[PDB]
Amino acid sequence: KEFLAKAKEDFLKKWETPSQNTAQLDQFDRIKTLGTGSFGRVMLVKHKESGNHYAMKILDKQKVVKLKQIEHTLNEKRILQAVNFPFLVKLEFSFKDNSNLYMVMEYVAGGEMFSHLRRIGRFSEPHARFYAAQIVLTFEYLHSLDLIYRDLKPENLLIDQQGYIQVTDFGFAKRVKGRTWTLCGTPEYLAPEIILSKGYNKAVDWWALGVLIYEMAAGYPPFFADQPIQIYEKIVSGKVRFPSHFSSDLKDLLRNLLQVDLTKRFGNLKNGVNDIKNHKWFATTDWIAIYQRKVEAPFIPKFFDDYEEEEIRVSINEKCGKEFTEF
Ligand SMILES: Nc1ncnc2c1ncn2[C@@H]1O[C@H](COP(=O)(O)OP(=O)(O)NP(=O)(O)O)[C@@H](O)[C@H]1O
């Protein structure tokens, strides 16, 4: 109770006056390239003073502009510097220079829920429930700050060194008390009210939780087809069919999450998230023990120079200064 009001205070202070240039490139030893994103390399770095390892995402400002990802990139950074929750990736530092934006993230030698789910095929209900519980608490947290996530899917969930989820992508997340209109997400996870195009609210996250739980437990999502139009028709007008192996409790929870009418959808009623937390399917879930990450995860990921080292070259001339003023 009193912790949500404190969580709200801490978020609002940071949301209204975001932190900027909290570190600089010369404070990090550049070890090697971890991978490539849309806008540049992700590099393993060591903070010289603390000796902590981080994943430094390098975003070429010129490329962010060319791909029209300015607003998404600024939005994601503003949210990440303000939020604090066990299942949200942690932005430790941010800064910018003439060429680049730098998001110095907590280093997670984990796996991706997407590749893990696709390799295993499907999760048992107890294992799906373990992951689902984390998403329920995360949506509870984000919704208490009036954040709509609206991009849930296995692809946006990393599995960390302790086998817990971290939500990794906030480009699409919006701070909004009530209704909003922007079309976004991935076809298979779109809530019917998004497709119906007369506006939607935070209830779209509870729909997407239904899609995620179904996909984890079945190994495939409830609505799919060769073309996005046929998916949209099934979402708005069609019925789900549950595999025979789904428990009665799972089918009941999913009937109330995959509820086409947002006014009857669990998470969106008078009792809010408690209709989900107190559902029979979650009877065995110790919500505090999940939050405190005291539950044994069912899967632990099995975690020198770059093949060709490329140096970072920062221009002596400022690129796209006006666009990224607030970064
Ligand atoms: N916090 C992190 N800790 C460790 N490795 C990371 C971290 N973030 C990213 N990586 C690595 O960098 C790669 C590409 O970065 P990533 O953030 O996934 O790209 P993006 O621009 O966010 N888009 P995407 O590749 O679709 O996820 C990942 O596949 C990982 O190998």
C-alpha to C-alpha distance for 327 and 321, rounded to whole angstroms: 10
Three-state DSSP at 165 gives strand
C-alpha to C-alpha distance for 78 and 171, rounded to whole angstroms: 10
Structure tokens at 225: 């087809």
By most ligand atoms within 8 Å of CB, the mutation choice from 34, 58, 151, 186 for ligand 1 is 34
Structure tokens at 316: 């002596």
Residue 121, marked binder: no
34 lines ligand 1 (CB under 6 A): yes
DSSP-derived letter for residue 107 is P
Q: What are phi and psi of 205, to 5 degrees?
A: -70, -40
Three-state DSSP at 126 gives helix
Count other Cβ atoms within 10 Å, centred on residue 200: 23
Q: Which atom of ligand 1 is nearest to the CA of 42?
A: 12
187 Cβ partners below 8 Å, 6+ apart?
Answer: 228, 231, 232
C-alpha to C-alpha distance for 194 and 293, rounded to whole angstroms: 33
Task: Give the bridge partners for 58, in sequence order.
Answer: 102
Asked if 50 and 143 count as a contact pair (C-beta separation under 8 A), the reply is no
Count other Cβ atoms within 10 Å, centred on residue 234: 16
The technique by which this structure was obtained is X-ray
9 Cβ partners below 8 Å, 6+ apart?
Answer: none
- Closest C-alpha to ligand 1, atom 22: 37
Residue identified by tokens 């120079």 is 305
Three-state DSSP at 68 gives coil
Question: How large is the angle between the packed helices 125-144 and 203-218, nearest 10 degrees?
Answer: 170
C-alpha to C-alpha distance for 169 and 73, rounded to whole angstroms: 10
303 lines ligand 1 (CB under 6 A): no
CA atoms lying within 13 Å on the CB side of residue 272? 9
Q: Which atom of ligand 1 is nearest to the CA of 112?
A: 29
Residue 192, marked binder: no
178 lines ligand 1 (CB under 6 A): no
- Closest C-alpha to ligand 1, atom 6: 55
- Closest C-alpha to ligand 1, atom 26: 37
Q: Say how many residues make up the chain.
A: 327
Q: Which of 162, 109, 124, 77 is nearest to 246 (CA)?
A: 124
Task: Sketch out the chain's domains with CATH numbers.
Answer: 1-17+112-302 (1.10.510.10), 18-111+303-325 (3.30.200.20)
C-alpha to C-alpha distance for 174 and 151, rounded to whole angstroms: 11
- Beta 157-159 vs 147-148: how paired, if at all? unpaired
Q: Is the dihedral of CA 109, 114, 117, 118 positive or negative?
A: negative
Residues 54/51/61/73 CA torsion (nearest 10 deg) = 40
C-alpha to C-alpha distance for 321 and 133, rounded to whole angstroms: 42
Q: What share of the chain is helix, strand, coil (3-state, %, to 5)?
A: 40, 15, 45
Count other Cβ atoms within 10 Å, centred on residue 327: 23
Structure tokens at 116: 């893990």
CA atoms lying within 13 Å on the CB side of residue 86? 20
105 lines ligand 1 (CB under 6 A): yes
Residue 40, marked binder: yes
Residues noted as catalytic: 151
Structure tokens at 237: 């007008």
36 Cβ partners below 8 Å, 6+ apart?
Answer: 42
C-alpha to C-alpha distance for 156 and 5, rounded to whole angstroms: 28
